[PDB]
Amino acid sequence: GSMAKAAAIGIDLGTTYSCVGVFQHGKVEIIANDQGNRTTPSYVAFTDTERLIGDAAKNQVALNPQNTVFDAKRLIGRKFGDPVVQSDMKHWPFQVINDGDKPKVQVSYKGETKAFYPEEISSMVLTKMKEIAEAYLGYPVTNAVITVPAYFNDSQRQATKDAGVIAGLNVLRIINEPTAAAIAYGLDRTGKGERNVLIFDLGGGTFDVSILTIDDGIFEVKATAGDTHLGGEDFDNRLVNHFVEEFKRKHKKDISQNKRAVRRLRTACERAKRTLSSSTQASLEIDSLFEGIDFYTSITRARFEELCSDLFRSTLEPVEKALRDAKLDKAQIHDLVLVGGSTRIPKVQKLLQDFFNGRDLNKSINPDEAVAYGAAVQAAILIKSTRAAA
Ligand SMILES: Nc1ncnc2c1nc(Br)n2[C@@H]1O[C@H](CO)[C@@H](O)[C@H]1O
Ligand SMILES: [Mg+2]
């Protein structure tokens, strides 16, 4: 008759991390990779013997900075001369070259100098997400929905499809990240009448606010705003500067010139930052941090909140701007949706909830998984081929 169809997958192809889900048995399963991680770093590393993707690439970045590529999404579908590209290049340890006004990343790989287009690096990340899904399903996967930022233009959307095609995926559709987060909560299944939804997306390096209107399951992007210089890495930087000062006070030593010590400090700071989202204090314990000195200290959630206070408050400026652009008042927003790991920060949640006069925030779907969750829901809908009954 008709052989059973393979499940289609939903992929959130993120700037820093990617996530894959599948809708089966009336529910979404966010698929962990083989290191048990529900999100996979959007990193690709090159050596004389291997190409590493995901956790394996990110875990060896310290000693291979020139040949470990990350942030390809910031280059995808852009011209080499684009001012965004020119500024971003100063922060990256890997080489970005100009090939006919199109950026390419250039690395040492298997004994040669090789250059890749951003879509080729993204296809490597998509190949890892496809393999993660196939390890769980136990069969080859063909169909996928891939998400993009709402502000992506035609060139950026086509380059994302091209990345999916290089990876051997059939791209069912390119959908906006804020739309996918709304779909995850079933905000397009509430019936007739207009609903205004605000998506608050705080990432590792950027912050995006989107206002959508949903009428009879139809989405319209009403306004987008944000801050390209606001993310999780900025909170990590504030903790780094704080502990560098603390080591200076306590041991009369400036550690800031030993890259290993600074890196070990930053790694510890990011974990302490995560602990502070669930606990009112967190310990920091580093052995032989600098000059054989053990650094055993702590930080309260109140001190961390004070350290990043201006940064957390600045998330409300793009919210007010988006509301002005959508020509809406805060009471007119029906639903608030949180996206990004940085939204687990209690103070960030409290500031936004206080701004919307005590309103509940939708945060029941892990914010670092909501986009892939919605993409997986849509992928299952898009492959249906029901023939009507008489
Ligand atoms: N529980 C959490 N509390 C605070 N922050 C978090 C948490 N989980 C994640 Br994930 N993050 C941060 O989200 C960003 C994703 O690129 C990184 O900056 C992570 O540090
Ligand atoms: Mg995202």
Side-chain angles (χ1 to χ4, degrees), residues 276 279-281 299-309:
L276 291 170
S279 299
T280 56
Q281 66 288 321
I299 182 134
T300 63
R301 172 195 287 169
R303 186 56 176 129
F304 170 65
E305 283 170 356
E306 183 183 56
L307 284 167
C308 305
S309 59

Side-chain angles (χ1 to χ4, degrees), residues 151-160:
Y151 57 80
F152 262 24
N153 64 33
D154 290 345
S155 170
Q156 291 173 295
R157 288 166 196 272
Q158 182 57 57
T160 302

Side-chain angles (χ1 to χ4, degrees), residues 16-17 204 232-233 270 273-274 277 341-342 344-345:
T16 65
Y17 283 89
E233 74 180 278
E270 188 278 343
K273 178 189 74 182
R274 294 209 192 201
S277 290
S342 299
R344 296 195 195 264
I345 298 166

Side-chain angles (χ1 to χ4, degrees), residues 175-191 193-194:
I175 70 164
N176 293 333
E177 283 157 22
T179 295
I183 289 169
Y185 285 96
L187 302 183
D188 62 328
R189 288 193 272 112
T190 84
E194 280 202 311

Side-chain angles (χ1 to χ4, degrees), residues 190-191 193-221 223-247 249-256:
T190 84
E194 280 202 311
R195 277 192 99 89
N196 304 309
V197 181
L198 188 145
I199 313 287
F200 183 98
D201 193 342
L202 184 58
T206 64
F207 172 53
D208 296 309
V209 170
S210 304
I211 297 174
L212 313 176
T213 58
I214 321 163
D215 190 2
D216 232 348
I218 304 302
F219 286 90
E220 182 191 334
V221 178
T224 62
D227 190 333
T228 52
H229 288 67
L230 184 62
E233 74 180 278
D234 300 300
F235 314 145
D236 294 343
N237 287 340
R238 295 284 180 88
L239 283 164
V240 166
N241 296 339
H242 167 75
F243 289 124
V244 163
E245 184 189 303
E246 193 185 286
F247 198 94
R249 192 177 318 266
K250 170 80 193 163
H251 306 287
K252 324 274 180 291
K253 299 275 180 181
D254 180 11
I255 68 143
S256 69

Side-chain angles (χ1 to χ4, degrees), residues 12-17 73 147 149 177 201-204 206 208 339-341 367-368 371:
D12 167 7
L13 176 65
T15 308
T16 65
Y17 283 89
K73 189 164 170 182
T147 56
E177 283 157 22
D201 193 342
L202 184 58
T206 64
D208 296 309
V339 176
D368 56 352
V371 168

